Amino acid sequence: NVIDGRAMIASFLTLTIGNNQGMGDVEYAKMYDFYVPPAYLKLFDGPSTTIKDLWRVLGRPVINGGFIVGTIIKPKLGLRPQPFANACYDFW
Amino acid sequence: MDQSNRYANLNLKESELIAGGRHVLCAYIMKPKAGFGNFIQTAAHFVAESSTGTNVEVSTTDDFTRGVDALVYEVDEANSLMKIAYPIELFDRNVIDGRAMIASFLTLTIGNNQGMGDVEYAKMYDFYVPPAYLKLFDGPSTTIKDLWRVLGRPVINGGFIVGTIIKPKLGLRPQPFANACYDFWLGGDFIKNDEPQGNQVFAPFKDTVRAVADAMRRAQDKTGEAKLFSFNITADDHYEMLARGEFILETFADNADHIAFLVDGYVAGPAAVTTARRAFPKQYLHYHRAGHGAVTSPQSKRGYTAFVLSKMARLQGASGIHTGTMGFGKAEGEAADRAIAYMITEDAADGPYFHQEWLGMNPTTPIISGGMNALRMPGFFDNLGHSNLIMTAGGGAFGHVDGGAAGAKSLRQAEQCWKQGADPVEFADHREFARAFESFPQDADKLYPNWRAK
Amino acid sequence: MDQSNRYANLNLKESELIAGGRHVLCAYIMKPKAGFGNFIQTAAHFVAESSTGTNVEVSTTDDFTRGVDALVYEVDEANSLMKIAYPIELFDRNVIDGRAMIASFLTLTIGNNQGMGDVEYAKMYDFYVPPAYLKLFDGPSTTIKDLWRVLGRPVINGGFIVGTIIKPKLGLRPQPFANACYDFWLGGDFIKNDEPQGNQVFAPFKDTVRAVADAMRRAQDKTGEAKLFSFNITADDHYEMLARGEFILETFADNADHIAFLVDGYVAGPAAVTTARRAFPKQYLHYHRAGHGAVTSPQSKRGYTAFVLSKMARLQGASGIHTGTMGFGKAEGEAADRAIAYMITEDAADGPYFHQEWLGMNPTTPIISGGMNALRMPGFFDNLGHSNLIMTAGGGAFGHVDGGAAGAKSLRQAEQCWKQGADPVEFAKDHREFARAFESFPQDADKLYPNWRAK
Ligand SMILES: O=C(O)[C@@](O)(COP(=O)(O)O)[C@H](O)[C@H](O)COP(=O)(O)O
Ligand SMILES: O=C(O)[C@@](O)(COP(=O)(O)O)[C@H](O)[C@H](O)COP(=O)(O)O
Ligand SMILES: [Mg+2]
Ligand SMILES: [Mg+2]
């Protein structure tokens, strides 16, 4: 980045797994692993928020706060706002 | 008017108030002014002027209001001690993101009550914040770890960061400034703007920033080690802070993560701190507390102590704050101030009155500064117990007889001396350290009576 | 280290330093701590720690640095007096617009020197700013003139603005709060949030603002007179302040120029004040000073006085600032504080040590508050000499036996009483609301008017 000198995953992708995926003389190629050294590693954002903050909100230990019971609202689509909220209320 | 029946309930148990998690607790040293009400009456008026009331009865008051009254729950007149519990519902919240603000905490706990005519003085020594309120504060986003990471040090116990402040405080033009930076960086890690340095007519911000960036590159090329700089971005105007920070990070480019931002947090206020904390969360936030001594001094019996200031600074999100030299330097301070550092570094710690759990909130680095030099550090480290911190010595570094680089190396060797548990005079097989005796002979005379003989 | 030869020059003349216009002057009351240097030595170190130096010599110093040194030019050890001249080149300037910042003034003039080990205490009592530096400060953009204009009063000597603070300080939910506003506005002009009122969970910001706006509409419809409200928009976060101000002005719409923004300037700091000043220059900026007493109190020998704070607030761009009751209310204060108001209202005025020309910088309103009521007002006006100001009485209004409206009217009648030059007790015979204030605060009545009961 010009603005803050930090890294972008887009360049990593463009180079390591970009045009080489269209090569005519290659049948196939797939990346299974990659290593980033400290000088490059330290330039990525990394997570700023973690599960600890959810544990904290839940009143759990912020280290090994344990299992967070979750769901996804189903139907995937079709519930109008209040039925949606009713399903939310019920699960909660 | 006696409001004790409403605002005082001494039968409440601090342990229960703590267990409940619905109250902020504050401990004050307060003294009524002669010729008014007694201690509990005065404490009651104090609570009234600090929460829901005034100096007379008003008809608009209802029971819901009485429900959120702050209350005096503990007093000890012999020791002028007074503890007050504030329901957390009192404290203001951001409309935009529902988070807490220290400004409300200040307005309520140590605001108007500092102007009361019937009170001679009242000063805060400690406070407790329960989880529901604690979790609403920003806390630090960047820590000393990121500096260690940049320096190539271990991110756990990465050790001592040798720092300095550019002296003169003001007066250096851009290139001489950058030259002193280059010189110190040959032997040291860290350099900060002196707190007032910025965009003086004789040292324009952008020219200086460019020259220092060049100096950083030259120093890193010369030494093969990473170097850090803390730039002052303090301003009245939010957008000026933004302009300065943006220019700095863009200008430093691939060294942008070598940059810290200094904010004069006490005089410019929490708003500036928050501007920096929220605008540049990925840059070490260096809280400079210039002016604090007007209230934190033991000579003062009003306002709040340095301990309170530091704990607030940890809540506001400072990556580091000056905690003072703890009696070992030129500023007012005590050895017991070691307790302040522990309060800002640990996940759990004891204040003078309240125990505090931090729930994994990031630590704030204790920055040690104020008349320090190579000779004075061994005593300081002995009192604190560790060297996982940043130390800046302006005069202590540039006042070295052999220049800034030797000063830096003298600081480095001084810390190596402390970690080896060696005797300073005997340790002083180390020229730069030894020359600090000659640099500051009065100090040398005081700390090591017969250093000359040896 | 003795630094007197470098940082002290007692041969300098104050009149020439003033005439030169290249120096900020500051007057301090300072005392060295026993067991260190003498007065001039300590003053020299004080200057060193407040400009270009430190506690020891450094090889990095050049002649240019020595050229911009601050200097002690006057001392009086018998009276603990110390005066320092700061070259204006020292003070930080904005990159974006080249304007001054009070934060730099503070960092230098009253910053680190408050932590010095060889000083027992030091307190700033006055300061002088020359034209070249003065003109770089924002100054107020809106004044009491604009409230007078909104109220339909003359924009010159528009007279007394009757105000209150919503009490309880905290605890009222949106509609009861708005009900109290409506009640007061039937007899008064101006209402401010109490300083901590904002977005408490039991009183959400937007609901309260909407309810108050409705109360304003109803009150203006009821009285056929314009009403004013001062909303607290203080926050740590700049963008929260913006969000609050923007919501208020949009919500009040055609009554938007009836709105002032209150900022807790001392605890939140100059940045918040400046946020409001620069983001909303067309809205009256109401500077609230909660916490100042920690340093401004005469019990304190550190920091700065209320006079200094007020003069700074005028520089920062406050439309009005609280100056205290000058001994007539519940807070610590003296009659001589009348001098502060003059400093913030006039184009030229005298401080305890320095005369200040303001060169047409807008005035800042003295906002009077702290345990005031109708009975105590005549003496305050007698001491001050005018009523061109805003006065807010929370307990004095809502503590009135007949409620907020009668209290408001009692304050109104109290100022009319002072302006008519009438005897209060004789005046009370023909003005019920004023008279009921005697019964509302009988101890105040007993002290101020010994035999009011017989009459
Ligand atoms: O004098 C100064 O302004 C310093 O640069 C120290 O320089 P020196 O090392 O040359 O003395 C620091 O800002 C103070 O230590 C801050 O005070 P504190 O830490 O107490 O808040
Ligand atoms: O909370 C209060 O006490 C007030 O609302 C006054 O209420 P009352 O009218 O009922 O007394 C004001 O904020 C103080 O006067 C501020 O003090 P100052 O102006 O001196 O800075
Ligand atoms: Mg400094
Ligand atoms: Mg108030």
Swiss-Prot record, chain A:
Q: Where are the transmembrane segments?
A: none
The annotated active site, in chain numbering, is K74 (proton acceptor)
Top-level taxon of the source organism = Bacteria
Q: Which positions are annotated as binding substrate?
A: N19, K76
Report the sequence similarity comment from the record.
Answer: Belongs to the RuBisCO large chain family. Type II subfamily.
Other comment:
The basic functional RuBisCO is composed of a large chain homodimer in a 'head-to-tail' conformation. In contrast to form I RuBisCO, the form II RuBisCO are composed solely of large subunits.
Q: Give the record's subunit note.
A: Homodimer.
| Cited function | RuBisCO catalyzes two reactions: the carboxylation of D-ribulose 1,5-bisphosphate, the primary event in carbon dioxide fixation, as well as the oxidative fragmentation of the pentose substrate. Both reactions occur simultaneously and in competition at the same active site.
What is this protein's record name?
Ribulose bisphosphate carboxylase
Identify the species of origin. Answer: Rhodopseudomonas palustris (strain ATCC BAA-98 / CGA009)
UniProtKB/Swiss-Prot annotation, chain B:
Q: Which Pfam families match?
A: RuBisCO_large, RuBisCO_large_N
- Specify which residues bind substrate according to the UniProt entry for this protein: N112, K169, R289, H322, S369
Report the protein name in the record. Ribulose bisphosphate carboxylase
Does the record bear Cell wall biogenesis/degradation in its keywords?
Answer: no
EC number(s): the record gives 4.1.1.39
Any one Gene Ontology MF annotation carried by this entry is: magnesium ion binding
Cofactor(s) needed? Mg(2+)
Give the gene symbol: cbbM
HAMAP family according to UniProt: RuBisCO_L_type2
